[PDB]
Amino acid sequence: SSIPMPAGVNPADLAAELAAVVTESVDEDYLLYECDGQWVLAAGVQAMVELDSDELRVIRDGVTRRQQWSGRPGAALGEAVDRLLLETDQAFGWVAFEFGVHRYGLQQRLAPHTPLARVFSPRTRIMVSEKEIRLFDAGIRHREAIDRLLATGVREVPQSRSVDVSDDPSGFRRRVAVAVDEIAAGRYHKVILSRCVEVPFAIDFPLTYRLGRRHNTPVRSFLLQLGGIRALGYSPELVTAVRADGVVITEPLAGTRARDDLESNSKEIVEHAISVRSSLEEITDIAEPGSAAVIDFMTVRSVQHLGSTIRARLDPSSDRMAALEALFPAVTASGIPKAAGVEAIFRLDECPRGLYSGAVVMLSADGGLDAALTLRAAYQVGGRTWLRAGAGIIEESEPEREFEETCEKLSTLTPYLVARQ
Ligand SMILES: C/C=C(\Oc1cccc(C(=O)O)c1O)C(=O)O
């Protein structure tokens, strides 16, 4: 069913307000995913797939089926998610940074019960765009919430509450210096290290999402309440998109400014070129021979970046999870060469990273996959609320400038935190 979107109603506001009110009223988890002008609210859990380092669980109708798994995490997750998609048209969820370590032989360094992915089939889907609201399997209470919201309008967003991000309790400056020393010793070229920032008060996730969305222009965005986790984020990069017709895309970004300097700066050009070569090598491993190409190489995309589009056709011997695995973790938030960068993050960052630098995903029964890189995000789990931001460290990096860069990335969220109502 479809309802015309009334004039003067912003889709991000309506979708986040609908997520807040209806799911609390009917007692269900949800994931809201913004993708190319559609805010897709996946509400309620028909079935849940939980992939951990040491176990895979599928939970349906209150019953959990547990199993041991070995080999590639993408194969284990893909087999279970393909079964979900025999019964529903789409599945949604998140994939941890730790999902990408098996490829590099680092699986044995994960602690027991480390989460790798959470993917669910929803009971209801509501898609909100500037044009209309589309309803899929929406029952009486979900339809009544949409009607009430169109009559009452969205809530006014309250004033935000400040947070101090100047302290360094995790020793980010010291950790950057260790990475700089390893890079000078030739261990690797670049690594992204990060720091958590505790938010000392509880936040309202849907209101914070709406407020931050007015001041960010992301490639994708999300807001979720799933299995005891709340999270929201303004993803700056597409990890991968797989279409039903088999076309695979990845759009790495490297080099940033607040245009002539960025396009002529040797440091930005080298970092971009190296990322593009890495993505092309990874995509070529899952692609039909001769189908991989760089389209719009090193073009300029409040920040401006150098960007490239890598496109290929998925090989009939491969699949969307093998494509996600091949491109995971993203270079943008891991390092170069990837294997040494990922290994360095185990030693020099607070692990497990969990959602941070992993992905939020939307899968479709026709073979589609849309995976956004999780950065510029906030999380709440077990009574703890936190932000997390990092910076790419190269041989010339200085700990003080890198700490300042994390402050700049945190500023996408720190002025927009709405305290719990
Ligand atoms: C998408 C590319 C960029 O931004 C990020 C890279 C690494 C870490 C972060 C972060 O926010 O932690 C980030 O926003 C970049 O800074 O090149």
What is the topological layout?
Layout: E1 2-4, H1 11-26, E2 30-35, E3 38-52, E4 56-60, E5 63-67, H2 73-84, E6 90-95, E7 115-128, E8 132-136, H3 140-152, H4 172-184, E9 190-198, H5 205-214, E10 220-226, E11 229-235, E12 238-242, E13 247-250, E14 253-257, H6 260-264, H7 266-286, E15 293-300, E16 304-313, H8 320-326, E17 335-336, H9 338-348, E18 359-364, E19 369-373, E20 377-381, E21 384-393, H10 399-410
Antiparallel strand pairs: 1-8, 2-3, 2-10, 3-4, 3-7, 4-5, 6-7, 6-18, 7-8, 9-17, 9-21, 10-11, 11-20, 12-13, 12-19, 13-16, 14-16, 15-16, 18-19, 20-21
Helix pairs in contact: 1-3, 1-5, 2-8, 4-10
Bound molecules: 3-{[(1Z)-1-carboxyprop-1-en-1-yl]oxy}-2-hydroxybenzoic acid.
Question: What does this protein structure show overall?
Answer:
This is Salicylate synthase. It catalyses: chorismate = isochorismate; isochorismate = salicylate + pyruvate; chorismate = prephenate. Keywords: Isomerase, Lyase, Magnesium, Metal-binding. The chain is of the alpha+beta class and about 425 residues long. The protein has a 21-stranded antiparallel beta sheet that branches. It contains ten helices and 21 strands. A hairpin with a 2-residue loop joins strand 2 and strand 3. About 30% of the residues lie in helices and about 35% in strands. The longest helix has 21 residues. The structure holds 3-{[(1Z)-1-carboxyprop-1-en-1-yl]oxy}-2-hydroxybenzoic acid. 3-{[(1Z)-1-carboxyprop-1-en-1-yl]oxy}-2-hydroxybenzoic acid (0GA) binds next to strand 9, strand 14 and strand 21. 3-{[(1Z)-1-carboxyprop-1-en-1-yl]oxy}-2-hydroxybenzoic acid binds next to strand 9, strand 14 and strand 21.
